[PDB]
Design a protein around this motif. Structure first.
Motif, PDB file in Angstrom:
ATOM      1  N   UNK A 193      -0.539 -45.479 -36.609  1.00  7.56           N
ATOM      2  CA  UNK A 193      -0.085 -44.180 -37.093  1.00  7.56           C
ATOM      3  C   UNK A 193       1.439 -44.032 -37.082  1.00  7.56           C
ATOM      4  N   UNK A 194       2.101 -44.504 -36.017  1.00  3.40           N
ATOM      5  CA  UNK A 194       3.564 -44.390 -35.996  1.00  3.40           C
ATOM      6  C   UNK A 194       4.212 -45.153 -37.145  1.00  3.40           C
ATOM      7  N   UNK A 195       3.702 -46.340 -37.442  1.00  2.00           N
ATOM      8  CA  UNK A 195       4.235 -47.111 -38.553  1.00  2.00           C
ATOM      9  C   UNK A 195       3.976 -46.391 -39.876  1.00  2.00           C
ATOM     10  N   UNK A 196       2.756 -45.895 -40.039  1.00  2.00           N
ATOM     11  CA  UNK A 196       2.346 -45.304 -41.307  1.00  2.00           C
ATOM     12  C   UNK A 196       3.084 -43.993 -41.602  1.00  2.00           C
ATOM     13  N   UNK A 197       3.570 -43.330 -40.558  1.00  2.00           N
ATOM     14  CA  UNK A 197       4.248 -42.044 -40.711  1.00  2.00           C
ATOM     15  C   UNK A 197       5.776 -42.168 -40.653  1.00  2.00           C
ATOM     16  N   UNK A 198       6.288 -43.396 -40.698  1.00  2.00           N
ATOM     17  CA  UNK A 198       7.731 -43.626 -40.650  1.00  2.00           C
ATOM     18  C   UNK A 198       8.153 -44.606 -41.740  1.00  2.00           C
ATOM     19  N   UNK A 199       7.526 -44.490 -42.901  1.00  2.00           N
ATOM     20  CA  UNK A 199       7.797 -45.403 -44.003  1.00  2.00           C
ATOM     21  C   UNK A 199       9.105 -45.028 -44.673  1.00  2.00           C
ATOM     22  N   UNK A 200       9.882 -46.035 -45.057  1.00  2.00           N
ATOM     23  CA  UNK A 200      11.140 -45.807 -45.751  1.00  2.00           C
ATOM     24  C   UNK A 200      10.902 -45.509 -47.225  1.00  2.00           C
ATOM     25  N   UNK A 201       9.783 -45.991 -47.760  1.00  2.00           N
ATOM     26  CA  UNK A 201       9.450 -45.744 -49.158  1.00  2.00           C
ATOM     27  C   UNK A 201       7.944 -45.725 -49.386  1.00  2.00           C
ATOM     28  N   UNK A 202       7.524 -44.900 -50.339  1.00  2.00           N
ATOM     29  CA  UNK A 202       6.148 -44.870 -50.819  1.00  2.00           C
ATOM     30  C   UNK A 202       6.191 -44.937 -52.336  1.00  2.00           C
ATOM     31  N   UNK A 203       5.477 -45.903 -52.900  1.00  2.00           N
ATOM     32  CA  UNK A 203       5.473 -46.106 -54.341  1.00  2.00           C
ATOM     33  C   UNK A 203       4.050 -46.213 -54.864  1.00  2.00           C
ATOM     34  N   UNK A 204       3.904 -46.025 -56.168  1.00  2.00           N
ATOM     35  CA  UNK A 204       2.613 -46.176 -56.821  1.00  2.00           C
ATOM     36  C   UNK A 204       2.744 -47.198 -57.920  1.00  2.00           C
ATOM     37  N   UNK A 205       1.654 -47.917 -58.159  1.00  2.00           N
ATOM     38  CA  UNK A 205       1.577 -48.826 -59.288  1.00  2.00           C
ATOM     39  C   UNK A 205       0.279 -48.535 -60.019  1.00  2.00           C
ATOM     40  N   UNK A 206       0.198 -48.971 -61.264  1.00  2.00           N
ATOM     41  CA  UNK A 206      -0.894 -48.549 -62.116  1.00  2.00           C
ATOM     42  C   UNK A 206      -1.441 -49.726 -62.894  1.00  2.00           C
ATOM     43  N   UNK A 207      -2.764 -49.799 -62.955  1.00  2.00           N
ATOM     44  CA  UNK A 207      -3.438 -50.779 -63.787  1.00  2.00           C
ATOM     45  C   UNK A 207      -3.668 -50.144 -65.147  1.00  2.00           C
ATOM     46  N   UNK A 208      -3.103 -50.754 -66.180  1.00  2.00           N
ATOM     47  CA  UNK A 208      -3.214 -50.233 -67.532  1.00  2.00           C
ATOM     48  C   UNK A 208      -4.371 -50.914 -68.251  1.00  2.00           C
ATOM     49  N   UNK A 209      -4.754 -50.377 -69.400  1.00  2.00           N
ATOM     50  CA  UNK A 209      -5.880 -50.930 -70.126  1.00  2.00           C
ATOM     51  C   UNK A 209      -6.287 -50.063 -71.291  1.00  2.00           C
TER      52      UNK A 209
END
Ligand SMILES: CC(C)=CCC/C(C)=C/CC/C(C)=C/CC/C(C)=C\CC/C(C)=C\CC/C(C)=C\CC/C(C)=C\CC/C(C)=C\COP(=O)(O)OP(=O)(O)O
Length: 240
Positions: A193-209
């Motif tokens: 939890x400590x790692x998951x709540x102290x992220x420097x960045x959150x990004x999304x990627x997408x599968x196209x089709x």
């Protein structure tokens, strides 16, 4: 705390997995066996302190081991969490280290226990559709608001893609936590939890089709160049 029928670590990993030192992935499944209607894979890069989220389209045309090509969503229906994990690992050629499965009730209760989650609503179209979906029980307003569980559930169910709303709320839940069945102990979950709540960045990627409808059943056929690009990105992120 349920274990997968695959052993102590993902069969995709060539080397020994060290949970507390290695980059890792988490597959989140939302259920209304049943089909999976939310299918979000998150890969965590430990050294970079980053997360990348990917929503797998529920109708994605993929091989389901033992069942042939079919909609991704059916994997959980045919063989539960174990088969969904197998399907993801084959599709993306990466390990799925952890899996979390949740129904509607758990989701709504989590959001309410967190005193709601913050969402910036931007679309009159989405507001009107949710009104319709819920026969007017849920009426969202444009702008930044804290949604209760009922409201958040309506938001992630309406059909920006639905997958993108799901990832939006999932990240919002994490942010609020700063302020259901899985394959790791609660102790290990809490350890992450400590790692998951102290992220420097959150990004999304997408599968196209594109829409693939050979005979009155809708599939989403994946763009193979983008799929290969996504696979490489996730493999690099996990250090495999
Ligand atoms: C954001 C980020 C970087 C990471 C977040 C995820 C990670 C890594 C968690 C680490 C492990 C851990 C400690 C978990 C602790 C628990 C926690 C804090 C959160 C658990 C996640 C959670 C509550 C839910 C995950 C699934 C999500 C995002 C939403 C659930 C939605 C749900 C229950 C159901 C959605 C069903 C949907 C969308 C549609 C079904 O509607 P329908 O059939 O009527 O209509 P249709 O058939 O016509 O379409």
């Amino acid at each position: 705390h349920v274990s997968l029928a695959r052993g102590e670590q993902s069969v995709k990993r060539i080397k020994e997995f060290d949970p507390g030192k290695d980059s890792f992935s988490v597959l989140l499944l939302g259920i209304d066996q049943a089909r999976s209607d939310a299918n979000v894979l998150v890969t965590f890069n430990r050294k970079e302190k980053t997360a990348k989220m990917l929503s797998i389209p529920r109708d994605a045309y993929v091989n389901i081991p033992g069942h042939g090509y079919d909609k991704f969503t059916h994997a959980h229906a045919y063989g539960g969490v174990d088969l969904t994990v197998k399907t993801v690992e084959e599709m993306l050629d990466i390990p799925v280290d952890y899996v979390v499965e949740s129904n509607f009730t758990a989701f709504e209760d989590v959001v309410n226990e967190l005193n709601g989650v913050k969402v910036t609503v931007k679309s009159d179209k989405v507001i009107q559709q949710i009104k319709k979906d819920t026969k007017g029980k849920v009426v969202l307003q444009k702008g930044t608001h804290t949604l209760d569980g009922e409201e958040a559930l309506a938001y992630v169910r309406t059909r920006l893609l639905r997958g993108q709303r799901q990832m939006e709320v999932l990240s919002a839940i994490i942010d609020k936590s700063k302020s259901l069945k899985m394959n790791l102990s609660l102790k290990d979950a809490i350890g992450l939890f400590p790692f998951i709540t102290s992220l420097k960045s959150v990004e999304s990627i997408q599968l196209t089709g594109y829409d693939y409808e050979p005979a009155g059943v809708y599939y989403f056929k994946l763009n193979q160049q983008k799929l290969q690009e996504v696979k490489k990105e996730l493999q690099n992120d996990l250090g495999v």
